[PDB]
Assembly symmetry: D3
Homo-oligomer: 267 residues x 6
């Protein structure tokens, strides 16, 4: 299977790319006027060790900027520029009008650097968890960057981690506020079940042990301890793995370091 197939042939995500382009040119592209439209060649370079992520998003930028691109690696490939003399690896060869290439360049690179960063941090944390013999899952959170949720979640997947719930519409998550708002975990779960129906799971944050058998009895699908039915642990921290099914961390995606990429025209 191919991760990029998760993105619909057309939909809001492609309009996002258009809006990212507009964010960079609200009036006129002066540099484009001076550089002209002569066809040029260019190489996209990965300048740091990490996993390549964000290909279809970057590809869409190149498409809208009407360029021709040849990716040298599959998305998800782990790149190691430091095995290099030069300190970099060309992951793509681009051709098109000079102005178009230079227009696409910053936006496309901002996508790759951040997407790869998330994937790399994601893969690092799961391979690490995997090394201890842990068989459960490491999941992300909803603490994503405003407007970039689709991209960051996608990166989590590429990095080999679980995405966790996409949004507030996705898998219901009940807490203290929800439980005493209805009267009991049983009431919270029932009301939640009354509207989400059978198609979506309900997760309840439980602090006690009798706060959790009731939820399980109410029909909850996932139980969270917070520092048939699955068990989740919310905190992360590191170095702790027991037999919980899910360990969640915003560490695989938030406040994450980027992987440096670059682009240079040939001649």
């Amino acid at each position: 299977p191919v991760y990029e197939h998760l993105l619909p042939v057309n939909g809001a995500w492609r309009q996002d790319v258009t809006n990212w382009l507009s964010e960079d040119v609200p009036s006129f592209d002066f540099g484009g006027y001076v550089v002209g439209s002569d066809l040029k060649e260019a190489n996209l370079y990965c300048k740091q060790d990490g996993m390549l992520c964000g290909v279809p998003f970057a590809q869409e930028v190149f498409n809208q900027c009407e360029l021709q691109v040849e990716w040298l690696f599959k998305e998800g490939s782990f790149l190691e520029p430091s095995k290099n003399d030069s300190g970099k690896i060309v992951v793509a060869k681009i051709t098109g009008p000079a102005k178009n290439i230079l227009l696409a360049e910053r936006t496309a690179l901002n996508i790759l650097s951040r997407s790869s960063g998330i994937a790399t941090a994601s893969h690092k944390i799961i391979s690490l968890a995997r090394s201890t013999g842990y068989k459960g899952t490491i999941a992300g959170t909803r603490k994503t960057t405003p407007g970039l949720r689709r991209l960051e979640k996608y990166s989590m997947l590429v990095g080999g981690c679980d995405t966790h719930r996409y949004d507030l519409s996705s898998m219901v998550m009940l807490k203290d506020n929800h439980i005493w708002a209805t009267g009991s975990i049983t009431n919270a779960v029932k009301n939640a079940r009354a509207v989400c129906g059978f198609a979506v799971k309900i997760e309840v944050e439980c602090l006690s042990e009798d706060e959790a058998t009731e939820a399980i009895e109410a029909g909850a699908d996932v139980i969270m301890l917070d520092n048939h039915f699955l068990l989740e642990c919310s905190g992360g921290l590191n170095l702790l793995c027991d037999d919980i099914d899910i360990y969640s961390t915003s560490s695989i995606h938030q406040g994450t370091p980027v992987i440096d990429f670059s682009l240079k025209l040939a001649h």
Copy 2:
């Protein structure tokens, strides 16, 4: 003066907040249905040492979610939760229907954590540069997160750094590609000047010394060395300060750590 005044009373930025809200609820807010609309009180907590940033953006989220908020600190204030017994500081008191508060909570916090992160990294790097007796400026770059440029640039300012050029429409930046595309730095500068006019500056990346007096002679406003007229150094690295006017770094805003915030209802 007040930084938030940089944001127009109304414009695209407020629609961005609406879209961030939609990103979290594409269908239905199940948790909101279960929690109900009873008025509740809540405190926004800063859980890490850093500079508070993103207030008006978070405030707009609260406004659209129809809540009442009292900020306890001015934007830009340096918060130090570790001076605490508890390990946190309440920077805001919120009141409104339970569902509305819980709807606003993740998006608002995603704004604050990232905005403060950028401001904190920005302030740290400039105060550091300032400590050596450096009188120039530390500037950001265009390597911002797709769709979040307005917020990140704003954060740079709050953190005390220069924003540098906002976009490709803003101050022209000529490089090798532009110079030989026209024939000479003089030609590149002239063509650029022919379209940007007097109202906008032109910056030319110069590698040589005769690559820079010509630019200065062509009328360039800023000259970059890249690793009447100002001088800029592109690389960063640290620990190097001479007499350049501008030192640019994506370090104050890209791949930056976030400042952890939280929100909890009272009762």
Copy 3:
């Protein structure tokens, strides 16, 4: 709990109402010019027996048209105008400028008539299923009207039915095409599980009996026969109920009759 709380205080749905208004006035509201802005009173009338649905959507139309409204019944209330002398029941009292009322009138009524229609058909089919002693659920489908999915699903809920999966992003549904595309139901389920993760259910359409224990063994959450784990029957038809957990029908929402409403100014 209150169904309208499923709708976020703000989000795309309110912009939909604005767009519905624009759909009716692409240039000028000539009738509004002639009627003027004198404050008027008006009654919204239900002219057919059925369940009231679409209140918050209609309310939003009234809000944007700057009117004051008093609903006489709770959403979901079963109205019976034929118990009437007059043949109608006033479900709301509206006040505001004459032009504004007449602007809101068609769009608001188009919402109510269709929403109530779906709710009424939904409630009729589930109360009917309930009468035979059936304890399972009657669910809707994705055969909703383009652009009106949020409203129709909401109506399904009000009518007392299960919504089923909201969209292609919601609970995964594997079929023949997906199973041999991967090689086996086990492969289909695994790949699907590899990307949706733990937070979302996977449903597999099974035709055979060995086509279903494998799916159950693969970890599928729901199994469909199509004419721990739940069982669903896709066809509907009527008059057949056994012990399946879910019976799905587009009958509760597609090609559904509307409930006639009206609006008349007093004086």
Copy 4:
């Protein structure tokens, strides 16, 4: 002439199709990831007797999903699957990547089923009216589904009915509220004429006989009785035809039954 030519080569309607696609995939298309991009063949099937309608709209869905389609019948053709052994007729042959076909499938079918339903109900009511020797017109109304007005009106036309006024901007419609708001039918008509000008007709709902010669004298183009100049009757009901020019009914388009279509990949 060809009905589809009524749709502009480009405009808002194509963006509507994009938004319908987004309505189905707010995050990720899990089924698409599992099915892959192998080219597949597929047949669109009409499973009920009725008139084919909505071709260009469905075609646009297929275009955006990057598929190749061959329609086997002209829009408007009356299909009769029950003349079948199989009970269905293939109205189109589709080819493209498996994921793309399955992405397009529900949205495209939701268009066809509803559009054909309206066309079929429209054609049935007009052919029926035509059979009595009636030479006037059967028109629709503004009681269309929010957001789907363009599609439903188009379907009315295909079905052979008059669309009636498209919106509040289109042909002015004065009633009691408008007449006493200005003082007299003559005043209502004059004010309306003062703003709509010569290019658009004015229709006045008249209850009396002296309520109608005045309107005709004021210059009204159409007169409605409501249960040089044309005459319209608003009610419908059936089985009544006299010599009015227009008989309007929401029956040809609202609360209308759908025509069932399907789509299945070959192999």
Copy 5:
């Protein structure tokens, strides 16, 4: 009656104002930051003789910029600053935060200057036509400024002229291309009538005399000579009036001079 009532309480036109605001501030309002939010008073001044037009549009700008305004004249009032000592007339008094006032100022004035210009040119040409004893109408055209059609048409009305058809959806206009495309004026009219129905007029451009009785016989509502049924003359020119019903000119709205307005804060 009041012209501003032609604008729906809410719809696309208000979003246009928001977009005009964004067009002026794509990033940050530096001047707003420096001026601050102290409440200020200000007068809108009309600096040239002409008819005041565009009030509700300008008012919407002021509303979105959260200001308080008192208009001193009714829209349509003919202002004569040259009767002045000072050379200007205050048509409005504005109060609000300094930054907000200065934000609204250019956009609002760009609306007023152009709207009044169109109204003034419109009123001048019709009062002129009226002075010769002409009883027909002077109409505008579709040669409006891209994106500003609603505003310019509205201005035409205020100026006392007929708007003519709003768009291609409004009143059908057949020409040579349409007539021989179908075979005959009769065929062109019939096909056009087959889709626009009874609710909309059909106008046919006729060059001959037998090119016009046929159209009249086909049922055409308006006949154009181009340099029951109305007669129109397309050219304008001036100084020619006979007994045609409509004389059209882009002169009342295109390439029209603006009426100069200004805004100054007090203190």
Copy 6:
């Protein structure tokens, strides 16, 4: 260099063209239905002496309407139809389906007529200024038509004039309100400099001579008298040129006469 290269390959401007198309067809294109899709040939004619401007914008209309076009002149070429027998010059040859051509025709021409008008007025005023031996620049203003700023500024450039600042985000402009708001020109400039940074110029409107050396001392880049550092004169008027660097006038773009264009199908 080529002016059209100032426009990004993709961005908001192309969506503007789509919206201009929608502005003309909110429902159905009746004329298109009657004319059909037969391929036709057509010539775009310039009917008045002036400079051709707006090519890429018009070209985009033609692209979206799926037509094939051959421009006979380069943008900026000065056309002189009055050197003609016929009184017109064909500047483009268009081919495509009849309906598509007729759909594109009004919008495309509305672009050309206005864009060329601005360019022609711009070129006339600068060539005039140039004839007196003036070596400075003639600049535009922000008094542009709402929504059409990109097009009008572009036209200014083509006409050979300076655009001046694009928007409120572009080059800061301080006035009296800003100077006493901060305390002194020095304070106004400093605060402005504190937020715009080094990349953008600051212009201060000075009335006195000591109101201008301070600004120059504060670091202001441009000084305006209003009726290292440049000098600007705001008024225009004509027939006055001294040694100022910039003379600004809304005359080159606002209330400007249009250049008449036309389009006719062959056969």
